Amino acid sequence: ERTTGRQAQISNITAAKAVADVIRTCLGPKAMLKMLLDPMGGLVLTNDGHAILREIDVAHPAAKSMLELSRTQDEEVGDGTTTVIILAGEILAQCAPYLIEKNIHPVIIIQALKKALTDALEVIKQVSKPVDVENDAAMKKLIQASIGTKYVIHWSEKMCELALDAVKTVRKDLGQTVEGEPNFEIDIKRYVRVEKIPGGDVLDSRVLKGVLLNKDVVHPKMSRHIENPRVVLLDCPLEYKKGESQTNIEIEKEEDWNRILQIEEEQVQLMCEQILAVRPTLVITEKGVSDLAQHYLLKGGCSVLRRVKKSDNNRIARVTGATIVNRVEDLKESDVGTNCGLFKVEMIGDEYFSFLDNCKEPKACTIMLRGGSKDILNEIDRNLQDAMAVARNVMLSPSLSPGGGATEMAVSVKLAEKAKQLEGIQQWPYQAVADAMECIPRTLIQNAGGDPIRLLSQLRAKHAQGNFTTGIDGDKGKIVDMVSYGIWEPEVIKQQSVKTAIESACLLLRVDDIVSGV
Amino acid sequence: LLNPKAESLRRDAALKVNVTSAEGLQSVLETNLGPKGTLKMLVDGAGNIKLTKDGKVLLTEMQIQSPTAVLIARAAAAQDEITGDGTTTVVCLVGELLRQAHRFIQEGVHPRIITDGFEIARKESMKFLDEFKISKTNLSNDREFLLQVARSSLLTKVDADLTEVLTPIVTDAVLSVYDAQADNLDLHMVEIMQMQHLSPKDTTFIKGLVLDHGGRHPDMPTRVKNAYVL
Amino acid sequence: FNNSRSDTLFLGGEKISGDDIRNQNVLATMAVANVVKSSLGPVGLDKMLVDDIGDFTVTNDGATILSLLDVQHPAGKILVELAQQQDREIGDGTTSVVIIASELLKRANELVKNKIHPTTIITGFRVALREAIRFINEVLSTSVDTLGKETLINIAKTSMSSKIIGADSDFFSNMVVDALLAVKTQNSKGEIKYPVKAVNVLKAHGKSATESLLVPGYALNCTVASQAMPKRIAGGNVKIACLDLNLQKARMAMGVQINIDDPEQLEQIRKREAGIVLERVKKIIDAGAQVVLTTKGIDDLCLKEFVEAKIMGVRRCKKEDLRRIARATGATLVSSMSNLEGEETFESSYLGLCDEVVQAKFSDDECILIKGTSKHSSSSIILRGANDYSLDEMERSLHDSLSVVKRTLESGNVVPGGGCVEAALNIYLDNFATTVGSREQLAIAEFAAALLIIPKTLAVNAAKDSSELVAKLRSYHAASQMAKPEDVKRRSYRNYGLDLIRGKIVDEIHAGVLEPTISKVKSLKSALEACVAILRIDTMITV
């Protein structure tokens, strides 16, 4: 019913500690397998952190907040799902004795977590090292981190080309002191939307700039490409129009019957004549096209496309600029067909397609993927999004940070040094943040099999005297430098990792009561 | 760290249950192996008793709640589609390998090192697999060697008296369907038909096809030799 | 523990009476009030509201928590309806009103153990409430300290401290305070309120944020478009014409094309297309408009007519700004020029009025400054910042800042917050208790001491000691109320409240924490009526 006093603070930390404790063995490339027991006779052997917690039914509401935290992390970064949840769960565990046994007010701890978050972001920027974002050979070795241990490792070179050529098309990199700096905005969601074509080879997969249409041309003999195109978009079909009111044509006189039959053909030509007034080279309609409208527009020297989806024409309007106008008599001259390179109808996989591809980058592109089957295309799809997500974090900041527990320990050492110079009651919960940062590398040690206490203190000694680039090896499990075998990941992953971790930790600390009601 | 209506086995306690789960499935299937194996009963619940020594039919007819035996049964089903023989052999290798590993788990050895030791030894096992194997000639006059392969697949599931009955049947069934060349063989061309009223030791091979409905009339010829077909 | 099993008054349910229902009302009201006790004040913490489906939500708003809280008891149900009465009058403060009524019931419950009848306990609270309203009258004051000093800048400084804008905020708070006081207006029938949507905010990045300018009037971003026309007109007055439809050469339609078969129709239709808009330009010059603001632009031929007359034309004005300029100039934005069969600007009808129009040089920016129109009571802010992302955070912060400032100043009657009202009434009613001297003196004394729960729990949520600050809060007011009624003073030094950010006692009037009087008077009035409704229950029949 109601949880008052310190009982609510216990249940909020315990719920977040239980969610993190499950995936502690899910961290690292060597991470163990989790066998889940379904209410039925089935089982789940998947080690993916998101696929596990999704199949785990939770009761306490703080556990549901940790589930929604991983959903936000999945939209930002493609990997490291368990890294954020374990880190956010350990911070509440380390602040638990200070909140109760030491009797520190929670607002003091929350204000201390905001100071530790700002200091942590500064340390990550200091331990991060720059890399050339314009080097094609360097970007392939970066994305390769999210490539290997997958079926795409053989095509990885082609997987990086499809990843780079896609983000480089939709990215706008600008800055100045006049109109401001967009800070290298890249949209993978809307603009990079992909079309998967079965059959063929991965080498034949191209990134097309434009909107791809699966519908063919109404007539076999027609202009294949136009130099300076004029495009008209309209939802209305092409056929004889009828009045919305009651229309009855009574024919008595003998010679007036054939005249009305000619007018019906003239009305179809009139609707096409209103389109030809702007001299379009391309006509795209949502519904079908009558055979008469096909012949009238064929002699008019324009291209006709039929049975095109409405959602596709909306994406065409942004890369082109032609606005959909229902009635042919209302067609504006302001909307044009400029920046369309080729109409090429070339057949791909025994199926006629239509290409809107151009020579320019109107902040969007359509990726054409080829594979050996639909399951291969689905594997290329999800891997391409993770491939571009890594390339996105590299284009959203030049600096790379060492992984494998190197950055995790590098921050914890600097937090311990700033703790001695930070006066006030917030010093005690500030030291709990550094102890929570040591949980991630110690977790990789526990999954490796080595002594967690011995290897952690020795790894901390490497950061204190030597450099911060000495991490833990995944294959071996012994303390080594990350410069030898680069595990290096972009900094944006570490940025949003500690960022949302403090926001999720403070959110649960602010709730002192839980009641049930509608 | 618990919520209502939940159960969790943690901190090496799941390993003691999973290894025991393999020891329970192993000891049941340990009884039937090779020609000296044993026969078991499978009740479908409808009252039909079925006796078979094949581990493929056994694992499908039994229902096991233990999730460790489920993965063994699912993986053996993939082995039954690929290999088609040695279902018990795979189970006996899995159970004993976990027993030898569980002894090292009690010693404090991390399971990753244990699994890494299996993959390294498996790669070395594949090297000895190619060295120990014997290359047999492609000659189809090898029936003498096919008599040895037949007794391998027969003697296991039978009293060895049906072996001498089924040895010329199975060996002649393969070579008659198989043309002489390297092309392929079709198992669908061999029909499997069952009849009652006569002892199993009288099982014979049919070079042609067998059918049920015959000519009905007392004066129709019973034996017609070298006749045209319509 | 639970009360049940009447075995009296045979009916379809139980009977609870005596100290059984009196103790039940205290336990029920306490559990309902304990939810909003930790959310009191800005230092309070939000709590989670879970439904029956298993979903939840987290918010610190006391109006939403009490509305979504499930109360199965009638004593707490009055508190639920109390939040509805508080939302329909003031709209805010449900958190503090519940805490008051909760402590008043606890104080009245101890009076029952003192053998004091609850009827006099009710009347004893009503008599103290009549004086409490009169005591607020010596507390409350009008708008003060806005000349010679600024107490309003401390409000904007604390609100913008969470944004990048808070660095220069000391200079930026002066821009918000000095503008809001100058934009004061009167809408209809003596309201005297500050305009909500006024004080236009524009942004440009050429430089640092310190260079942001405050214009006493509207700043429109536009040019003259021709160097032959003068950049400064209107010494005495000007008539500004806000226009939408273009003055450009008129076409017919975008889908029709003009094909000339007869060369006579060529010159005819040509000069007719320009002649339609040229006459519309003639109606503007004859209307006495020195400044012409057009949304869709002006042609070159029609602009030359403005050059020869020294009339200022402007092309492609922002239509969203012209709507607010027309309201200040008394003008009306013309979307198309016509009435019935005619076309004209009606000779200074749709036209506006303004004192002066001057075009300042902003050092790589150029705009039009509008100052002193007919009835405006508005201004405009030209922002400069580190980048557009900074200018976006500034415009959002100036709206979040001014909003807190303008709502409190909208009511000309405010009282100091931070616990000043609750602590001051505790001192006044303590001396007023000696004016009765029979029975209610015990009820009035507990009524005044019950007001100390508001500053108490307010300091608890701030991670500060409530035993010290509250004890010091009463000492400063008690010593200041010694020489105050005698009309002889060395130094007054009253109105010291609680500062929970720095953990020290400061003057709330100088700190900028103020609440309107209508909020505090109706709070004690609503909390008392809810406490009386609980004290009036001597019996409960539960089916």
Instruction: Quote the CA–CA distance of B69 and B19 in Å, as a whole number.
Output: 10
Q: Do the beta carbons of residue B62 and residue B52 sit within 8 Å?
A: no
Among C178, C200, C502, residue whose Cα is nearest residue C327: C200
Instruction: Quote the CA–CA distance of A275 and A230 in Å, as a whole number.
Output: 11
The DSSP secondary-structure symbol of B187 reads S
**Amino acid in position A8:** A
**Amino acid in position C2:** N
Cα-Cα-Cα-Cα dihedral sign, residues C58, C61, C63, C66: positive
Whether C58 sits inside 8 A of A330 (CB atoms) is: no
Q: Do the beta carbons of residue C534 and residue C29 sit within 8 Å?
A: yes
CB neighbour class for C217 (10 Å; exposed up to 12, middle 13-18, buried from 19): buried
Q: How far is CA A217 from CA A196, A226, A308, C320, in A?
A: 21, 15, 11, 46
**Amino acid in position B143:** R
**Other C-beta atoms lying within 10 Å of the C-beta of residue B152:** 12
Instruction: Quote the CA–CA distance of C350 and A418 in Å, as a whole number.
Output: 67
Closest partner residue to A2 (CB to CB) among C31, C387, C462 is: C31
Residues paired with residue A92 on neighbouring β-strands, in sequence order: none
Contact residues, C window 432-491, toward A, CB-based 8 Å cutoff:
461-463
Closest partner residue to A329 (CB to CB) among C48, C69, C255 is: C255
Q: Do the beta carbons of residue A387 and residue A143 sit within 8 Å?
A: yes
Counting one residue from A and one from C, how many pairs have CB atoms under 8 Å apart? Answer: 86
Distance (Å) from the C-alpha of residue A82 to the closest C-alpha of chain B? 18
The DSSP secondary-structure symbol of C250 reads P
Using DSSP's 3-state secondary structure scheme, residue A511 falls into coil
Instruction: Quote the CA–CA distance of C220 and C240 in Å, as a whole number.
Output: 13
Instruction: Provide the CB-side half-sphere exposure for C25 (13 A, CA).
Output: 30
Range of the domain at A311: 210-357
Instruction: Quote the CA–CA distance of C331 and C353 in Å, as a whole number.
Output: 8
CATH number at C144-215+377-412: 3.30.260.10
Q: How far is CA A166 from CA A58, A134, A189, A424, C110, in A?
A: 39, 14, 12, 51, 75
Tell me whether A33 touches chain B (CB under 8 Å).
no
Record the tokens describing residue C326, joined without a space: 């027309």
Active-site residue flag, C400: yes
Among A50, A53, A24, residue whose Cα is nearest residue A36: A53
Among C441, C525, C543, C538, residue whose Cα is nearest residue C82: C525
Give buried/exposed letters for C441-472 (b at 16+ CB in 10 A, else e).
ebbbbbbbebbbbbbbbbbbbbbbebeebbee
Instruction: Quote the CA–CA distance of B97 and C336 in Å, as a whole number.
Output: 90
Instruction: Quote the CA–CA distance of A18 and B3 in Å, as a whole number.
Output: 9
Q: Do the beta carbons of residue A462 and residue A451 sit within 8 Å?
A: no
Helix (H) or strand (E) holding C214, with range, is strand C213-215
CA–chain centroid gap for C257, Å, is: 56
Instruction: Quote the CA–CA distance of A384 and A390 in Å, as a whole number.
Output: 10
Among C419, C510, C414, residue whose Cα is nearest residue C473: C419
Instruction: Quote the CA–CA distance of C518 and B167 in Å, as a whole number.
Output: 106
Tell me whether A344 touches chain C (CB under 8 Å).
no
Work out the angle at residue C389's Cα, subtended by the Cα atoms of residues C383 and C394, and round it to the nearest 5 degrees.
40
Whether A513 sits inside 8 A of C254 (CB atoms) is: no
Q: Taking CB atoms and an 8 Å cutoff, what residues of chain A touch B113?
A: 449
Distance (Å) from the C-alpha of residue A15 to the closest C-alpha of chain B? 7
Ranges of beta strands (E only) in A345-460 are 354-355, 366-371, 399-401
**Dihedral angle computed from the Cα positions of residues A52, A54, A55 and A60, in that order, rounded to the nearest 10 degrees:** 110
Using DSSP's 3-state secondary structure scheme, residue C16 falls into strand
Among A367, A383, A233, A258, residue whose Cα is nearest residue A311: A233
Q: Do the beta carbons of residue A302 and residue A288 sit within 8 Å?
A: no
Record the tokens describing residue B28, joined without a space: 């049941």
Using DSSP's 3-state secondary structure scheme, residue A364 falls into coil
Counting one residue from A and one from B, how many pairs have CB atoms under 8 Å apart? Answer: 36
Q: What is the largest CA-CA distance in chain C?
A: 112
CB neighbour class for C318 (10 Å; exposed up to 12, middle 13-18, buried from 19): middle
Record the tokens describing residue C410, joined without a space: 């909208």
Whether A18 sits inside 8 A of B2 (CB atoms) is: yes
If phi > 0 it is left, if psi is from -120 to 50 it is alpha, else beta; for residue B27 that is: alpha
The DSSP secondary structure of C388-453, one letter per residue, reads HHHHHHHHHHHHHHHHHHHHHHHSS-EEETTTHHHHHHHHHHHHHGGGT-SSHHHHHHHHHHGGGH
Closest partner residue to B3 (CB to CB) among A43, A59, A449 is: A59
The set of residues, in sequence order, having a beta carbon less than 8 Å from that of C191 and lying 6+ positions away, is none
**Amino acid in position A69:** L
Please state the domain extents for chain C. 1-143+413-543, 144-215+377-412, 216-376
User: Which method was it determined by?
Assistant: cryo-EM
Q: Taking CB atoms and an 8 Å cutoff, what residues of chain A touch B70?
A: 41, 43
In the β-sheet with A399-401, what is the strand arrangement from edge to edge?
A: A129-130, A399-401, A489-490
Q: What is the largest CA-CA distance in chain A?
A: 108
Residues paired with residue C415 on neighbouring β-strands, in sequence order: C515
Which ranges of chain B would DSSP assign to H, the alpha helix? 13-29, 55-61, 67-82, 87-105, 111-132, 143-154, 161-177
Q: How far is CA C376 from CA C194, C195, C379, in A?
A: 12, 10, 8
Domain spanning C1-143+413-543: CATH superfamily? GroEL-like equatorial domain (1.10.560.10)
Q: Do the beta carbons of residue A217 and residue A283 sit within 8 Å?
A: no
Q: Please count the residues of chain C.
A: 543
Using DSSP's 3-state secondary structure scheme, residue C165 falls into helix
Instruction: Provide the CB-side half-sphere exposure for A135 (13 A, CA).
Output: 12
Instruction: Quote the CA–CA distance of C285 and A469 in Å, as a whole number.
Output: 76
Instruction: Quote the CA–CA distance of C416 and C497 in Å, as a whole number.
Output: 8
Q: Do the beta carbons of residue B70 and residue B22 sit within 8 Å?
A: no
Instruction: Quote the CA–CA distance of C198 and C193 in Å, as a whole number.
Output: 12
Q: Do the beta carbons of residue C198 and residue C377 sit within 8 Å?
A: yes
Instruction: Quote the CA–CA distance of A247 and A383 in Å, as a whole number.
Output: 58
CA–chain centroid gap for A508, Å, is: 27
Among B67, B75, B69, B81, residue whose Cα is nearest residue B28: B69
Instruction: Quote the CA–CA distance of A378 and A356 in Å, as a whole number.
Output: 24
Q: Taking CB atoms and an 8 Å cutoff, what residues of chain A touch B62?
A: none
Helix (H) or strand (E) holding A53, with range, is helix A49-55
Instruction: Quote the CA–CA distance of C280 and C284 in Å, as a whole number.
Output: 7
Q: Do the beta carbons of residue C286 and residue C294 sit within 8 Å?
A: no
Distance (Å) from the C-alpha of residue A509 to the closest C-alpha of chain C? 9
Tell me whether B62 touches chain A (CB under 8 Å).
no
Among B188, B189, B229, B193, residue whose Cα is nearest residue B211: B193
Helix (H) or strand (E) holding A121, with range, is helix A106-127
CATH number, domain containing residue A310: 3.50.7.10
Whether C46 sits inside 8 A of A510 (CB atoms) is: yes
